[PDB]
């Protein structure tokens, strides 16, 4: 599996990419506006996310912190990173099929188009101005957008029963962003590509 992490943003941006208790391949770089950072996978990838961070700031030893998506203050994400961040979420190789989607369960930071490299799939979209349009409640002060579980800790946010419905702030991530998450148990917005195809991330595609 091969990821082109393009950004396009007229900002820097610092890509993250990750698996939970590990890294995938180095596991985060710099992206200047339109540089692009292909990186490989390893198949089977269950739960792989990939993510962009905002004004960050590290040293001559790959540690220092952003204000949106800091994984634990490392260049190199070897673990996820803190919302608000607007997730391109993978699961590779599982029973001969590919599982991609874009989650603003955690939130919402960069637009992003997560899209694939190779035939027989389409690629889900979150490209509007979230931030700008984001509820007060919501509004992270270090820019982004949080989701209502990280702001409110609600059992009914987090969805921690596995019972739970829709909520005003979900439906505000599903009202600019329909083919993305909005909360645990949103109707499933995943798409299946074919096994080990290869995919691109696209930072603010729209600009």
């Known amino acids: 599996a091969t990821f082109?992490?393009?950004?396009?943003?007229?900002?820097?941006?610092?890509?993250?990419?990750?698996?939970?208790?590990?890294?995938?391949?180095?596991?985060?770089?710099?992206?200047?506006?339109?540089?692009?950072?292909?990186?490989?996978?390893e198949p089977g990838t269950n739960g792989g996310k990939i993510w962009a961070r905002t004004d960050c700031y590290f040293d001559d030893s790959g540690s220092g912190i952003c204000k949106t998506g800091d994984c634990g203050g490392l260049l190199r994400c070897?673990?996820?990173?803190?919302?608000?961040?607007?997730?391109?979420?993978?699961?590779?190789?599982?029973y001969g099929k590919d599982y991609i989607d874009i989650s603003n369960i955690k939130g919402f930071?960069?637009?992003?188009?997560?899209?694939?490299?190779?035939?027989?799939?389409?690629?889900?979209?979150?490209?509007?101005?979230?931030?700008?349009?984001?509820?007060?409640?919501?509004?992270?002060?270090?820019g982004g957008c949080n989701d209502a579980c990280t702001v409110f800790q609600t059992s009914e946010y987090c969805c921690t029963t596995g019972k739970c419905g829709p909520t005003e702030y979900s439906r505000f991530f599903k009202r600019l962003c329909p083919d993305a998450f909005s909360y645990v148990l949103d109707k499933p917005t995943t798409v299946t590509c074919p096994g080990s195809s290869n995919y691109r991330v696209t930072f603010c595609p729209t600009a």
Do not use: H
Not at 132 to 142: E, N, S, V
């Open 78 to 94: 070897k673990r996820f990173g803190r919302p608000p961040t607007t997730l391109a979420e993978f699961s590779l190789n599982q």
């Open 4 to 41: 082109e992490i393009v950004n396009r943003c007229s900002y820097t941006v610092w890509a993250a990419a990750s698996k939970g208790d590990a890294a995938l391949d180095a596991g985060g770089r710099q992206l200047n506006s339109g540089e692009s950072w292909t990186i490989n996978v």
């Open 109 to 142: 930071n960069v637009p992003m188009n997560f899209s694939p490299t190779t035939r027989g799939c389409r690629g889900v979209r979150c490209a509007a101005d979230i931030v700008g349009q984001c509820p007060a409640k919501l509004k992270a002060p270090g």
